[PDB]
């Protein structure tokens, strides 16, 4: 015919979506030399 | 609270050196950026440089180098900003600001002139006219050649118009004015006085003002 096959199961939303992926890379130190670089640093969660 | 505020210097001659002492004991000890803020009397606000206690790091900036030196000392708790091999350029006045998210804790601050110049007394010259009902009054000054001086009028009891006055340069001596305003009730039947006074050349100058 042929039959068939090959189910769209990784074509899905959550397959797609659901992968660790990196947002934001923070970063800070311990002696604080300038700004950026100090300690203590933040970030407003945006994707 | 950061106690207290920063110290005091004056012209010291040529070839030695002067030393602030900026006194902040806010503690907070001992790691943080002592930055040092100086402003002209052009209002612009520059940076002389910062200074850290816990290791030893200080800093510079490139009209302020060659050798102006940030020493810390944790057991007084203050910090050097002095600055030697000078020029008169470097009459401004120096701020302390500590660390912060911004510059947060500033200081009172010091405006240090530095010259080879000459103390000069000052000169009260009666400025009265030779008709209305109330007539602006004053005295003016002329050729005091350090910036500090005193203004007065009747010693904190005709202290309502009394207008302050810069005294802006011309040919190195200092020219400012004080004018108060007088009611026609008083003048000329209370005797009306200016009392000046020079800090760095220690000399009073008194004079009465008589109606011309």
């Known amino acids: 015919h042929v039959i068939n096959y090959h189910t769209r199961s990784e074509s899905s939303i959550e397959n797609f979506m659901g992968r660790a992926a990196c947002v934001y890379i923070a970063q800070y130190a311990t002696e604080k030399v300038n700004d950026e670089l100090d300690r203590y640093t933040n970030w407003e969660i945006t994707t | 609270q950061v106690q207290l505020q920063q110290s005091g210097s004056e012209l010291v001659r040529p070839g030695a050196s002067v030393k602030l002492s900026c006194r902040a004991s806010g503690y907070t000890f001992t790691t943080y950026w002592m930055h040092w803020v100086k402003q002209r009397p052009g209002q612009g606000l520059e940076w002389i440089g910062n200074?850290?206690?816990?290791?030893?790091?200080?800093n510079y900036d490139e009209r302020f180098k060659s050798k102006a030196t940030l020493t810390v000392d944790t057991s007084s708790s203050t910090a050097y900003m002095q600055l030697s091999s000078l020029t008169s350029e470097d009459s401004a006045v120096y701020y302390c600001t500590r660390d912060l998210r911004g510059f947060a804790y500033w200081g009172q601050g010091t405006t240090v002139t530095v010259s080879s110049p000459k103390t000069t007394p000052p000169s009260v010259y009666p400025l009265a006219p030779a008709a209305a009902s109330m007539v602006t009054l004053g005295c003016l000054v002329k050729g005091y050649f350090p910036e500090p001086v005193t203004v007065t009028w009747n010693s904190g009891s005709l202290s309502s118009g009394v207008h302050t006055f810069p005294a802006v340069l011309q040919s190195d001596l200092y020219t400012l004015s004080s004018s108060v305003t007088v009611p026609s009730s008083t003048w000329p039947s209370e005797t009306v006085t200016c009392n000046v006074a020079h800090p760095a050349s220690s000399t009073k100058v008194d004079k009465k003002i008589v109606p011309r």
């Open positions: 200074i850290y206690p816990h290791s030893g790091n200080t």
